[PDB]
CSV table of C-alpha atoms and ligand atoms in Angstrom, one decimal:
chain,number,residue,atom,x,y,z
A,1,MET,CA,0.0,0.0,0.0
A,2,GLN,CA,2.7,2.5,1.0
A,3,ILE,CA,6.1,2.2,-0.7
A,4,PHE,CA,9.3,4.3,-0.7
A,5,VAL,CA,11.1,6.0,-3.5
A,6,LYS,CA,14.7,7.2,-3.3
A,7,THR,CA,14.6,10.3,-5.6
A,8,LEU,CA,17.4,11.9,-7.5
A,9,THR,CA,18.7,13.9,-4.6
A,10,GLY,CA,18.7,10.8,-2.4
A,11,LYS,CA,16.0,11.9,0.0
A,12,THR,CA,13.4,9.1,0.2
A,13,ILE,CA,9.7,9.9,-0.2
A,14,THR,CA,6.6,7.9,0.3
A,15,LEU,CA,3.8,6.9,-2.1
A,16,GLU,CA,0.3,5.4,-1.6
A,17,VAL,CA,-0.5,2.8,-4.3
A,18,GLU,CA,-2.5,-0.3,-4.9
A,19,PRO,CA,-0.9,-3.6,-5.9
A,20,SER,CA,-3.3,-3.5,-8.9
A,21,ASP,CA,-2.0,-0.1,-10.0
A,22,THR,CA,0.1,0.0,-13.1
A,23,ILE,CA,3.7,1.3,-13.1
A,24,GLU,CA,2.5,4.3,-15.2
A,25,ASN,CA,0.3,5.5,-12.3
A,26,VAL,CA,3.3,5.1,-10.0
A,27,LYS,CA,5.5,7.3,-12.2
A,28,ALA,CA,2.6,9.8,-12.4
A,29,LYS,CA,2.6,10.0,-8.6
A,30,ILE,CA,6.4,10.7,-8.8
A,31,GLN,CA,5.5,13.7,-11.1
A,32,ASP,CA,3.0,15.0,-8.5
A,33,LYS,CA,5.6,14.5,-5.7
A,34,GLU,CA,8.7,15.7,-7.6
A,35,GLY,CA,7.6,17.7,-10.7
A,36,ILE,CA,9.5,15.3,-13.0
A,37,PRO,CA,8.0,14.2,-16.3
A,38,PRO,CA,7.2,10.5,-16.5
A,39,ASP,CA,9.0,10.1,-19.9
A,40,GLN,CA,12.3,10.9,-18.1
A,41,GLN,CA,11.7,8.5,-15.1
A,42,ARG,CA,13.5,5.2,-14.9
A,43,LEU,CA,12.5,3.0,-11.9
A,44,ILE,CA,14.8,0.3,-10.6
A,45,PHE,CA,13.7,-2.4,-8.0
A,46,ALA,CA,16.0,-5.2,-6.9
A,47,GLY,CA,18.3,-4.3,-9.7
A,48,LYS,CA,15.6,-4.9,-12.3
A,49,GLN,CA,14.1,-2.0,-14.2
A,50,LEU,CA,10.4,-1.6,-14.2
A,51,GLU,CA,8.8,-1.5,-17.6
A,52,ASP,CA,5.6,0.4,-18.6
A,53,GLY,CA,2.3,-1.5,-18.6
A,54,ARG,CA,3.3,-4.0,-15.9
A,55,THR,CA,1.6,-3.6,-12.5
A,56,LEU,CA,3.4,-3.7,-9.1
A,57,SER,CA,2.3,-7.3,-8.6
A,58,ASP,CA,4.2,-8.4,-11.7
A,59,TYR,CA,7.4,-7.3,-10.1
A,60,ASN,CA,6.2,-8.6,-6.7
A,61,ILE,CA,6.6,-5.2,-5.1
A,62,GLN,CA,5.4,-5.6,-1.6
A,63,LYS,CA,4.4,-3.0,1.0
A,64,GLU,CA,7.3,-0.8,2.3
A,65,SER,CA,9.4,-1.5,-0.8
A,66,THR,CA,12.1,0.9,-2.0
A,67,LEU,CA,12.2,1.9,-5.7
A,68,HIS,CA,15.2,3.8,-7.1
A,69,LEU,CA,14.6,6.8,-9.5
A,70,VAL,CA,17.2,7.7,-12.1
A,71,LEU,CA,17.2,10.0,-15.1
A,72,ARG,CA,17.4,8.8,-18.7
A,73,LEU,CA,20.7,10.2,-20.2
A,74,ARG,CA,20.8,11.1,-23.9
A,75,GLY,CA,23.3,11.9,-26.6
B,78,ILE,CA,51.5,2.1,-30.4
B,79,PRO,CA,48.4,0.6,-28.7
B,80,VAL,CA,48.7,-3.2,-28.4
B,81,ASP,CA,46.7,-5.9,-26.6
B,82,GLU,CA,48.1,-8.5,-24.3
B,83,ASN,CA,48.1,-11.1,-27.2
B,84,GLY,CA,50.0,-8.6,-29.4
B,85,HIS,CA,46.9,-7.6,-31.3
B,86,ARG,CA,46.5,-4.0,-32.3
B,87,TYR,CA,43.6,-2.3,-30.5
B,88,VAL,CA,40.4,-1.8,-32.5
B,89,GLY,CA,37.9,1.0,-32.2
B,90,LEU,CA,34.2,1.2,-33.2
B,91,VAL,CA,32.6,3.3,-35.9
B,92,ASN,CA,30.4,6.1,-34.6
B,93,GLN,CA,27.3,5.6,-36.6
B,94,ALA,CA,24.8,8.4,-36.1
B,95,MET,CA,25.1,9.3,-32.4
B,96,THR,CA,25.8,6.0,-30.6
B,97,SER,CA,29.1,6.8,-28.7
B,98,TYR,CA,27.5,5.3,-25.5
B,99,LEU,CA,27.1,2.0,-27.3
B,100,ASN,CA,30.8,1.9,-28.2
B,101,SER,CA,31.8,2.8,-24.6
B,102,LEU,CA,29.5,0.1,-23.2
B,103,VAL,CA,30.8,-2.6,-25.6
B,104,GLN,CA,34.4,-1.7,-25.1
B,105,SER,CA,33.8,-1.8,-21.3
B,106,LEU,CA,32.1,-5.2,-21.4
B,107,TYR,CA,34.6,-6.6,-23.9
B,108,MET,CA,37.3,-5.5,-21.5
B,109,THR,CA,35.7,-7.4,-18.6
B,110,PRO,CA,37.6,-10.7,-18.4
B,111,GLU,CA,34.9,-12.8,-16.8
B,112,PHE,CA,32.3,-11.3,-19.2
B,113,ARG,CA,34.4,-11.7,-22.3
B,114,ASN,CA,35.4,-15.3,-21.4
B,115,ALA,CA,31.8,-16.1,-20.7
B,116,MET,CA,31.0,-15.0,-24.2
B,117,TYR,CA,33.5,-17.5,-25.7
B,118,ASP,CA,32.2,-20.3,-23.6
B,119,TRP,CA,28.7,-19.7,-25.1
B,120,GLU,CA,27.8,-21.8,-28.1
B,132,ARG,CA,16.0,-22.2,-44.2
B,133,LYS,CA,16.0,-19.0,-42.2
B,134,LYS,CA,18.9,-17.9,-40.0
B,135,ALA,CA,18.4,-15.9,-36.8
B,136,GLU,CA,21.1,-13.3,-37.1
B,137,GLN,CA,19.0,-11.1,-34.7
B,138,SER,CA,20.3,-12.9,-31.6
B,139,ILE,CA,21.9,-10.2,-29.4
B,140,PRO,CA,24.2,-12.8,-27.8
B,141,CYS,CA,25.4,-14.0,-31.2
B,142,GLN,CA,26.1,-10.5,-32.5
B,143,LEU,CA,27.7,-9.5,-29.2
B,144,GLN,CA,29.9,-12.6,-29.4
B,145,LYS,CA,30.8,-11.8,-33.0
B,146,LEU,CA,31.6,-8.2,-32.1
B,147,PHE,CA,33.9,-9.4,-29.3
B,148,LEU,CA,35.6,-11.9,-31.6
B,149,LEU,CA,36.2,-9.2,-34.2
B,150,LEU,CA,37.3,-6.7,-31.5
B,151,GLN,CA,40.1,-9.2,-30.6
B,152,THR,CA,41.2,-11.0,-33.9
B,153,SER,CA,40.6,-8.4,-36.7
B,154,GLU,CA,43.4,-6.3,-38.2
B,155,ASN,CA,41.0,-3.5,-39.2
B,156,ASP,CA,40.9,0.2,-38.4
B,157,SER,CA,37.4,0.2,-37.0
B,158,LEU,CA,34.3,-2.0,-36.4
B,159,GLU,CA,30.7,-1.2,-37.3
B,160,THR,CA,28.1,-1.8,-34.6
B,161,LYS,CA,25.3,-1.9,-37.3
B,162,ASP,CA,24.9,-5.7,-36.8
B,163,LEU,CA,24.4,-5.3,-33.1
B,164,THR,CA,21.9,-2.5,-33.6
B,165,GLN,CA,20.0,-4.7,-36.1
B,166,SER,CA,19.9,-7.4,-33.4
B,167,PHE,CA,18.1,-4.9,-31.1
B,168,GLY,CA,15.6,-4.2,-33.9
B,169,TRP,CA,16.5,-0.6,-34.5
B,170,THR,CA,16.1,1.8,-37.4
B,171,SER,CA,17.6,5.1,-36.3
B,178,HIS,CA,17.8,5.3,-25.7
B,179,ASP,CA,20.4,5.7,-23.0
B,180,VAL,CA,23.3,3.4,-21.9
B,181,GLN,CA,21.7,2.0,-18.8
B,182,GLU,CA,18.6,0.9,-20.7
B,183,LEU,CA,21.0,-0.5,-23.3
B,184,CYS,CA,22.8,-2.5,-20.7
B,185,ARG,CA,19.5,-3.9,-19.5
B,186,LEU,CA,18.5,-5.0,-23.0
B,187,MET,CA,21.8,-6.8,-23.4
B,188,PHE,CA,21.8,-8.5,-20.0
B,189,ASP,CA,18.2,-9.6,-20.1
B,190,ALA,CA,18.7,-11.0,-23.6
B,191,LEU,CA,21.7,-12.9,-22.3
B,192,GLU,CA,19.8,-14.1,-19.2
B,193,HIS,CA,16.9,-15.2,-21.4
B,194,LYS,CA,19.2,-17.1,-23.8
B,195,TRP,CA,21.1,-18.7,-20.8
B,196,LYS,CA,18.1,-20.1,-19.0
B,197,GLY,CA,18.9,-23.8,-18.5
B,198,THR,CA,22.5,-23.2,-19.4
B,199,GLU,CA,25.2,-23.3,-16.7
B,200,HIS,CA,25.4,-19.5,-17.1
B,201,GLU,CA,21.8,-18.9,-16.0
B,202,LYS,CA,22.8,-17.1,-12.8
B,203,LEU,CA,26.0,-15.6,-14.2
B,204,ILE,CA,24.9,-12.0,-14.5
B,205,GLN,CA,23.7,-12.4,-10.9
B,206,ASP,CA,27.0,-13.7,-9.6
B,207,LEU,CA,29.0,-11.0,-11.4
B,208,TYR,CA,26.9,-7.8,-11.1
B,209,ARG,CA,24.3,-8.4,-8.4
B,210,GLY,CA,24.8,-7.0,-4.9
B,211,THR,CA,23.0,-7.5,-1.6
B,212,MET,CA,21.7,-4.9,0.9
B,213,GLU,CA,18.8,-4.5,3.3
B,214,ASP,CA,16.3,-1.7,3.7
B,215,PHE,CA,15.2,-0.9,7.3
B,216,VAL,CA,12.3,1.3,8.5
B,217,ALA,CA,12.2,1.9,12.3
B,218,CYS,CA,9.1,3.5,13.8
B,219,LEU,CA,10.2,5.9,16.5
B,220,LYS,CA,7.1,5.8,18.7
B,221,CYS,CA,6.9,2.0,18.8
B,222,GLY,CA,10.7,1.5,18.6
B,223,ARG,CA,10.2,-1.3,16.1
B,224,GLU,CA,12.4,-1.9,13.0
B,225,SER,CA,11.2,-3.7,9.8
B,226,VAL,CA,14.1,-5.0,7.7
B,227,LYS,CA,13.6,-6.6,4.3
B,228,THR,CA,16.3,-8.0,1.9
B,229,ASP,CA,16.8,-6.1,-1.4
B,230,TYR,CA,19.4,-6.5,-4.2
B,231,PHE,CA,21.0,-4.0,-6.5
B,232,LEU,CA,22.7,-4.2,-10.0
B,233,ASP,CA,24.2,-0.8,-10.3
B,234,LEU,CA,24.8,1.7,-7.4
B,235,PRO,CA,23.4,5.2,-8.2
B,236,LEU,CA,25.2,7.9,-6.1
B,237,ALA,CA,24.1,11.5,-5.8
B,238,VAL,CA,26.4,14.4,-6.5
B,239,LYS,CA,24.3,17.5,-5.4
B,240,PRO,CA,21.8,16.8,-2.6
B,241,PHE,CA,20.0,20.0,-3.4
B,242,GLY,CA,19.9,22.4,-1.8
B,243,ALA,CA,23.5,21.7,-0.6
B,244,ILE,CA,25.8,24.6,-1.2
B,245,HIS,CA,28.8,22.2,-1.2
B,246,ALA,CA,28.5,19.0,-3.3
B,247,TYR,CA,30.2,15.8,-2.2
B,248,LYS,CA,33.9,16.0,-3.0
B,249,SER,CA,34.6,12.3,-3.2
B,250,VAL,CA,32.9,9.0,-4.1
B,251,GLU,CA,33.4,7.7,-0.6
B,252,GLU,CA,31.5,10.6,0.9
B,253,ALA,CA,28.6,9.9,-1.6
B,254,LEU,CA,28.7,6.2,-0.5
B,255,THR,CA,28.5,7.1,3.2
B,256,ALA,CA,25.5,9.4,2.5
B,257,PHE,CA,23.9,6.7,0.5
B,258,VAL,CA,24.0,4.3,3.5
B,259,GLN,CA,23.1,7.1,5.9
B,260,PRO,CA,19.8,6.7,7.9
B,261,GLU,CA,17.4,9.4,6.8
B,262,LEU,CA,14.5,10.8,8.8
B,263,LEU,CA,11.0,10.6,7.3
B,264,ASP,CA,9.3,14.0,7.5
B,265,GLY,CA,5.7,14.7,8.4
B,266,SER,CA,4.6,14.7,4.8
B,267,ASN,CA,6.2,11.3,4.3
B,268,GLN,CA,5.6,9.6,7.6
B,269,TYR,CA,5.8,5.8,7.9
B,270,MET,CA,2.6,3.7,8.3
B,271,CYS,CA,3.6,1.6,11.4
B,272,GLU,CA,1.2,-1.3,11.8
B,273,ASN,CA,2.0,-1.6,15.5
B,274,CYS,CA,1.4,2.2,16.0
B,275,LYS,CA,-1.9,2.1,14.1
B,276,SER,CA,-1.1,5.6,12.7
B,277,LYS,CA,1.3,7.6,10.7
B,278,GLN,CA,4.5,8.1,12.6
B,279,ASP,CA,8.0,9.5,12.4
B,280,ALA,CA,10.5,6.9,11.4
B,281,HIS,CA,14.1,6.3,10.3
B,282,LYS,CA,14.5,5.2,6.7
B,283,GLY,CA,17.8,3.8,5.5
B,284,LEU,CA,19.7,1.2,3.5
B,285,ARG,CA,22.9,-0.7,4.4
B,286,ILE,CA,25.0,-2.9,2.2
B,287,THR,CA,25.4,-6.5,3.4
B,288,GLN,CA,27.4,-7.7,0.4
B,289,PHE,CA,29.1,-6.1,-2.6
B,290,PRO,CA,29.0,-7.6,-6.1
B,291,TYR,CA,32.1,-9.1,-7.7
B,292,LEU,CA,31.9,-6.5,-10.6
B,293,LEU,CA,31.0,-3.2,-8.8
B,294,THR,CA,29.0,-0.9,-11.2
B,295,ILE,CA,28.7,2.5,-9.7
B,296,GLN,CA,26.8,5.4,-11.3
B,297,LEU,CA,27.2,9.1,-10.7
B,298,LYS,CA,24.0,11.3,-10.8
B,299,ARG,CA,25.5,14.2,-12.7
B,300,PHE,CA,22.3,14.8,-14.7
B,301,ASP,CA,19.7,16.7,-12.6
B,302,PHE,CA,16.4,18.4,-13.3
B,303,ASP,CA,15.4,22.0,-13.0
B,304,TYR,CA,11.9,23.0,-11.7
B,305,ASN,CA,11.4,26.4,-13.4
B,306,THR,CA,12.7,25.7,-16.9
B,307,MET,CA,11.8,21.9,-16.9
B,308,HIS,CA,15.1,21.3,-18.8
B,309,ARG,CA,17.7,18.8,-17.6
B,310,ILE,CA,21.2,20.1,-16.7
B,311,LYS,CA,24.5,18.5,-16.0
B,312,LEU,CA,26.3,19.0,-12.7
B,313,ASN,CA,30.0,19.5,-13.4
B,314,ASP,CA,30.9,19.6,-9.7
B,315,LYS,CA,34.1,18.0,-8.6
B,316,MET,CA,34.0,14.4,-7.5
B,317,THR,CA,37.1,12.3,-7.0
B,318,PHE,CA,37.5,8.5,-7.1
B,319,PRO,CA,40.7,6.4,-6.5
B,320,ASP,CA,41.9,3.4,-8.5
B,321,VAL,CA,41.8,1.2,-5.3
B,322,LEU,CA,38.6,1.3,-3.4
B,323,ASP,CA,38.3,0.1,0.2
B,324,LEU,CA,34.7,-0.7,1.2
B,325,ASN,CA,35.1,-2.6,4.4
B,326,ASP,CA,33.6,0.1,6.6
B,327,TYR,CA,30.3,-0.2,4.7
B,328,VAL,CA,29.7,-3.9,5.6
B,329,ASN,CA,29.0,-4.5,9.3
B,381,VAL,CA,44.1,14.7,-1.4
B,382,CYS,CA,45.0,11.2,-2.7
B,383,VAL,CA,46.2,9.9,-6.1
B,384,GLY,CA,45.8,6.3,-7.3
B,385,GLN,CA,46.0,6.6,-11.1
B,386,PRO,CA,49.6,5.4,-11.3
B,387,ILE,CA,50.1,1.6,-11.6
B,388,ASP,CA,48.9,-0.4,-8.6
B,389,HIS,CA,51.0,-2.1,-5.9
B,390,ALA,CA,50.5,-5.6,-4.4
B,391,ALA,CA,52.1,-4.5,-1.1
B,392,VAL,CA,49.6,-1.7,-0.5
B,393,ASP,CA,46.9,-4.2,-1.4
B,394,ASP,CA,48.1,-6.6,1.3
B,395,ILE,CA,48.3,-3.9,4.0
B,396,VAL,CA,44.6,-3.1,3.4
B,397,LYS,CA,43.8,-6.8,2.8
B,398,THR,CA,44.8,-7.5,6.4
B,399,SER,CA,42.3,-5.1,8.0
B,400,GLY,CA,39.6,-5.8,5.5
B,401,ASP,CA,38.6,-8.3,2.7
B,402,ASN,CA,36.5,-6.0,0.5
B,403,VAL,CA,38.9,-4.1,-1.8
B,404,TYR,CA,38.1,-3.3,-5.4
B,405,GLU,CA,40.1,-2.1,-8.5
B,406,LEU,CA,39.0,0.5,-10.9
B,407,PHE,CA,39.2,-0.6,-14.6
B,408,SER,CA,36.7,1.4,-16.6
B,409,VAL,CA,35.8,5.1,-16.4
B,410,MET,CA,32.7,6.1,-18.4
B,411,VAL,CA,32.9,9.9,-19.1
B,412,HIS,CA,30.6,12.3,-20.8
B,413,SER,CA,31.5,15.6,-22.5
B,414,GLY,CA,29.3,18.3,-24.1
B,415,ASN,CA,25.8,19.5,-23.7
B,416,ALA,CA,23.7,18.1,-20.9
B,417,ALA,CA,20.7,17.1,-23.0
B,418,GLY,CA,23.0,15.4,-25.6
B,419,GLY,CA,26.7,15.1,-25.9
B,420,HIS,CA,29.6,12.7,-26.6
B,421,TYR,CA,30.5,9.6,-24.6
B,422,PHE,CA,33.9,7.9,-24.3
B,423,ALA,CA,35.7,5.8,-21.7
B,424,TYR,CA,39.1,5.5,-20.1
B,425,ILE,CA,39.5,1.7,-19.9
B,426,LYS,CA,42.3,-0.3,-18.1
B,427,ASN,CA,43.5,-3.7,-19.2
B,428,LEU,CA,43.5,-5.8,-16.0
B,429,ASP,CA,46.1,-8.2,-17.3
B,430,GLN,CA,48.3,-5.5,-18.7
B,431,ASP,CA,47.9,-3.0,-15.8
B,432,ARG,CA,47.8,-0.1,-18.2
B,433,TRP,CA,45.4,2.8,-18.8
B,434,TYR,CA,44.1,3.3,-22.3
B,435,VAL,CA,41.5,5.7,-23.8
B,436,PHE,CA,38.6,4.4,-26.0
B,437,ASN,CA,36.9,7.2,-28.0
B,438,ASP,CA,34.8,5.7,-30.9
B,439,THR,CA,37.2,4.7,-33.7
B,440,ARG,CA,40.3,6.2,-32.0
B,441,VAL,CA,42.0,4.1,-29.3
B,442,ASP,CA,45.1,5.5,-27.7
B,443,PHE,CA,47.2,5.4,-24.5
B,444,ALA,CA,45.9,7.2,-21.5
B,445,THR,CA,48.0,9.3,-19.1
B,446,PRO,CA,47.0,9.6,-15.4
B,447,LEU,CA,46.7,13.3,-15.9
B,448,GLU,CA,43.7,13.4,-18.2
B,449,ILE,CA,41.9,10.7,-16.1
B,450,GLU,CA,42.2,12.9,-13.0
B,451,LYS,CA,41.4,16.1,-14.9
B,452,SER,CA,37.9,14.8,-15.6
B,453,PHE,CA,36.8,14.8,-11.9
B,454,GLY,CA,35.3,18.3,-12.4
B,455,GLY,CA,36.1,22.0,-12.2
B,456,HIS,CA,35.5,24.6,-14.9
B,463,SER,CA,34.9,21.0,-22.7
B,464,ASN,CA,33.6,20.2,-19.2
B,465,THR,CA,34.2,16.5,-19.5
B,466,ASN,CA,33.4,14.4,-16.4
B,467,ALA,CA,33.0,10.8,-15.5
B,468,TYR,CA,29.4,9.6,-14.9
B,469,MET,CA,29.9,5.8,-14.4
B,470,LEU,CA,32.8,3.8,-12.9
B,471,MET,CA,33.5,0.1,-13.1
B,472,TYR,CA,35.4,-1.8,-10.4
B,473,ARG,CA,36.3,-5.5,-9.8
B,474,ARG,CA,36.9,-7.2,-6.5
B,475,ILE,CA,40.6,-8.1,-5.9
B,476,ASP,CA,40.6,-11.9,-5.3
B,477,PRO,CA,43.8,-13.7,-6.3
B,478,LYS,CA,41.9,-16.9,-7.2
B,479,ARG,CA,38.7,-15.6,-8.7
B,480,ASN,CA,40.3,-12.8,-10.8
B,481,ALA,CA,40.6,-14.2,-14.3
B,482,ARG,CA,42.6,-13.3,-17.4
B,483,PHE,CA,41.5,-12.9,-21.0
B,484,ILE,CA,41.5,-16.1,-23.0
B,485,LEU,CA,44.3,-16.4,-25.5
B,486,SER,CA,43.1,-16.7,-29.1
B,487,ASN,CA,44.6,-20.2,-29.6
B,488,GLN,CA,42.5,-22.2,-27.1
B,489,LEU,CA,39.1,-21.1,-28.5
B,490,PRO,CA,37.0,-24.1,-29.7
B,491,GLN,CA,35.0,-21.7,-31.9
B,492,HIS,CA,36.0,-20.9,-35.5
C,1,ZN,ZN1,5.5,2.0,15.6
């Protein structure tokens, strides 16, 4: 229900989500919490990157889990 | 004159369109002894599209071809591309190797080489109860500018200590303690229980701006040594010259987790889009070289240190280390013993 996200600065924030919620909704809540576009977000959990369209249950993300947020570099 | 350990002339990679990061990632992986040797151990319509097969072919040509440069077009065609970062690239290659290696002895090879182990703890302060769950990590993203901090972290070790530092959850982000039956103040933190064999560490030099909504690069100074001691994490200094086995033993005695830098992924140019190249070190030769697209040359310790920061504003954004174990550390396979022709 409530999972943690270590943002770019390193300060960890909290999010309220359902296990049925898609990862796109999670990245949307990161936008509301950080003002970062979802197209630039890349979430990493247990070393595995989370892909769009798959829910949090697909990755077995349980309550109190910690996701890692990193920016997509280009060039 | 650049020469490999088997007396082969170093070979670069053609910079087709803007894919310098691909060249830097391939030259880093191809430089990894355990990863390269793993590749050689691996064995109507024909499926050229196999990313493992094309990556194996590119490694073979990178080692036994007397050519000026090599084209990565075949590898891009294996991805399924017609005209996008380096980390996402590394995930596509590794997951394609993990999928092809299911059932093979190398099924858990990417895990044993690149996966680390840590634990996340959340301690409610009213109840005084701590909840710890095991979590793993492939790369290690470290922050440079914890904004607003007037002074950015001057060294990688200082960024590591801040990464494993217990942080306090504020009122807007209070922890839902089940025993407390309410939102509560709590200590959030992460602590490393084990380091991976191949330590992949990433520097967060690319930050986002709120007002302009345009990404920017943080060229702040951050130092990293060639030898890395990380025994304090499991419970001016210069290292760019050639290593020493005696200094390794004196730190070996007081700690068993010491790592050796062998690849330095750097980025130069505009923040939104620039050029990527890497200072790569041959672990068997003990020599620093520079890999920049088609041009491969020797590397002096001066230009490697000059990229830490300080103002074409070129700075390293990713570093690759390997654990120093006399028995586990492997060498590149000589060309002769390959059973693949
Ligand atoms: Zn409590």
